[PDB]
Design a protein around this ligand. Structure first.
Ligand SMILES: *[C@@H]1O[C@H](CO)[C@@H](O[C@@H]2O[C@H](CO)[C@@H](O)[C@H](O)[C@H]2NC(C)=O)[C@H](O)[C@H]1NC(C)=O
Ligand SMILES: *[C@@H]1O[C@H](CO)[C@@H](O[C@@H]2O[C@H](CO)[C@@H](O)[C@H](O)[C@H]2NC(C)=O)[C@H](O)[C@H]1NC(C)=O
Ligand SMILES: *[C@@H]1O[C@H](CO)[C@@H](O[C@@H]2O[C@H](CO)[C@@H](O)[C@H](O)[C@H]2NC(C)=O)[C@H](O)[C@H]1NC(C)=O
Ligand SMILES: *[C@@H]1O[C@H](CO)[C@@H](O[C@@H]2O[C@H](CO)[C@@H](O)[C@H](O)[C@H]2NC(C)=O)[C@H](O)[C@H]1NC(C)=O
Ligand code: NAG
Ligand code: NAG
Ligand code: NAG
Lengths: 50, 423
């Protein structure tokens, strides 16, 4: 009814896609790390590179 | 262009064929193409909800593109029914094949085949040879169901001539069914019975040559193969377009979703939607225009079926070279094959001829056929096969004195009543 925008439907076959037509997709997490990154060694260097 | 030929025309001269030859000719028509459908939501967005909410901003684009393809997908079955569903009852032939020496065993269903194909259908099904929210839908009739109708039409034609087309099938001995089809081409039925053994061999040999023709080369079947190829070609292109960037930074939608802020993503993704959607609109337009061409061919096949199988043609070269005698259908991938059977005049001789003959003042004309002379005797003859008979008051009619007709000639028109009255 929603797919045809009609409250009444005739005899036949009708296509549709709405119910989730693929099974349980879901996304989480990453590979791992060992330290905080060394930004302060550049950002608070005494004098920078040429 | 071709070989030149001055036709040896003169107002006193005619050529009449002294002999004839049966021919069989193959003809091949497309009838229905690969039924397809697309979930545009899935194709455009790869089931990203973010992208799906942008696709809502284009409104009823996706629904109408899916509607148009569903419309084509229905009429491919209807084309196939319009060609094959012309026989209302499934006839089948009795076991004994005494068709006066005609040998249909190549084109009848072969009991060895589990799908009930003829031998020559089982050549055709061998000479002829996608997955991302796109789909192919299978046809409403299986290839075995098509092979049943191309049995029923064939069994009806062998056993009952035109009659099963007009009304219920009425049996007739096959030699006589050819005799009336011969009168249909204006060659008098006595010519058939007086030559029957020669005729059945000229026919059986041509069926023999068709096995060779459709075994030895695929080259004729290209006309059906193209319908498979073009739909495979379009579907492969419609998929490869997903690699197009369309002026976004990537073809992989998950890149944009992972790397960017909504403000930038809702620019980038809207380029991808614009591109993919225009790519689909291109394919759907091609299928509408291609479907219109196949439907025109299906209606031509439906006509060929109703006129040249269920009947006899009086339309010159609608159904092969020669005058039309008969035709048979054979089922094939995406299409139909016709075997037309036709009469061809085969050995000329020249004759002197006249439009009329004058007797004792009376101008006589032939009731049918032509007045011809070998040089000394004057004969009536039927037009398309030489059969010289003496010109007489019962094969002629009279209109006026000699003088009116151009180029009239004199011979006695013999009068078959007279020797009886002489008794
Ligand atoms: C008419 O043409 C046919 C061939 O189209 C001739 O048929 C051959 O007839 C001879 C005997 O007369 C046989 O030895 C051959 O085997 C026949 N050929 C075939 C294909 O069957 C026929 O002779 C011709 N008839 C006339 C009167 O010219
Ligand atoms: C009808 O034609 C078929 C072939 O089209 C003939 O069948 C072959 O007959 C020979 C013996 O004459 C056998 O060695 C073959 O194995 C047969 N082939 C098949 C496919 O059956 C058949 O003999 C012909 N019949 C008539 C009455 O003419
Ligand atoms: C025209 O046809 C007639 C009939 O076939 C030919 O006349 C016959 O010729 C044979 C010898 O070949 C004779 O035995 C018959 O008595 C003849 N019949 C008649 C009615 O005369 C005639 O020779 C042919 N003429 C030409 C020029 O071919
Ligand atoms: C057919 O036969 C008649 C005679 O039976 C021929 O008629 C003669 O024709 C010439 C020339 O026109 C006239 O001078 C004569 O007076 C005609 N005789 C009669 C009795 O009418 C006629 O020429 C013949 N025609 C052909 C085509 O052979
Ligand atoms: C750099 O030095 C400033 C003070 O000069 C300090 O506030 C800041 O936290 C330092 N940042 C890093 C990344 O070392
Ligand atoms: C028929 O007769 C004409 C007379 O001029 C001749 O030119 C022609 O070659 C002949 N044709 C055949 C097939 O004998
Ligand atoms: C027949 O045609 C020839 C030329 O081919 C001509 O000389 C002759 O007069 C014509 N005769 C008739 C009766 O038309």
């Amino acid at each position: 009814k929603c797919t045809l925008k009609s409250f009444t439907v005739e005899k036949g076959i009708y296509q549709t896609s709405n119910f989730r037509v693929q099974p349980t997709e879901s996304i989480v997490r990453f590979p791992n790390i060992t330290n905080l990154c060394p930004f302060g060694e550049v950002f608070n260097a005494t004098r920078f590179a040429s | 262009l071709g070989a030149e030929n001055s036709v040896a025309y003169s107002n006193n001269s005619i050529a009449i064929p002294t002999n004839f030859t049966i021919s069989v000719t193959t003809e091949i028509l497309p009838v229905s193409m690969t039924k397809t459908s697309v979930d545009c939501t899935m194709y455009i967005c790869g089931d990203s909800t973010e992208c799906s909410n942008l696709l809502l901003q284009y409104g009823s684009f996706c629904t109408q593109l899916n509607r148009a393809l569903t419309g084509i997908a229905v009429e491919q079955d209807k084309n196939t029914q319009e060609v094959f569903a012309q026989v209302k009852q499934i006839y089948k032939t009795p076991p004994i094949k005494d068709f006066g020496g005609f040998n249909f065993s190549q084109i009848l269903p072969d009991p060895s085949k589990p799908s009930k194909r003829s031998f020559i259908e089982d050549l055709l099904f061998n000479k002829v040879t996608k997955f991302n929210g796109l789909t192919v839908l299978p046809p409403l009739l299986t290839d075995e169901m098509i092979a049943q109708y191309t049995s029923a039409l064939l069994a009806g034609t062998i056993t009952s001539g035109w009659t099963f087309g007009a009304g219920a099938a009425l049996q007739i001995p096959f030699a006589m069914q050819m005799a009336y089809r011969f009168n249909g081409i204006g060659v008098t039925q006595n010519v058939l019975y007086e030559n029957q053994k020669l005729i059945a061999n000229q026919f059986n040999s041509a069926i023999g040559k068709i096995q060779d023709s459709l075994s030895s080369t695929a080259s004729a079947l290209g006309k059906l193969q193209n319908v498979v190829n073009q739909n495979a070609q379009a579907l492969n292109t419609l998929v490869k377009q997903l690699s197009s960037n369309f002026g976004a930074i990537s073809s992989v939608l998950n890149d944009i979703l992972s790397r960017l802020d909504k403000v930038e993503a809702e620019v980038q993704i809207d380029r991808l939607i614009t591109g993919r959607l225009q790519s689909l609109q291109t394919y759907v337009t091609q299928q509408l225009i291609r479907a219109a061409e196949i439907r025109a061919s299906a209606n031509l096949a439906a006509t060929k079926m109703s006129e040249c199988v269920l009947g006899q043609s009086k339309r010159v070269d609608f159904c092969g070279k020669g005058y039309h005698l008969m035709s048979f259908p054979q089922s094939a991938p995406h299409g139909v094959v016709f075997l037309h059977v036709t009469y061809v005049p085969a050995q000329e001789k020249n004759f002197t001829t006249a439009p009329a003959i004058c007797h004792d003042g009376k101008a006589h004309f032939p009731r049918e056929g032509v007045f011809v002379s070998n040089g000394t005797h004057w004969f009536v003859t039927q037009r398309n096969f030489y059969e010289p008979q003496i010109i007489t008051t019962d094969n002629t009619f009279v209109s006026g004195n000699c003088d009116v007709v151009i180029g009239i000639v004199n011979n006695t028109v013999y009068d078959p009543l007279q020797p009886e009255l002489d008794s």
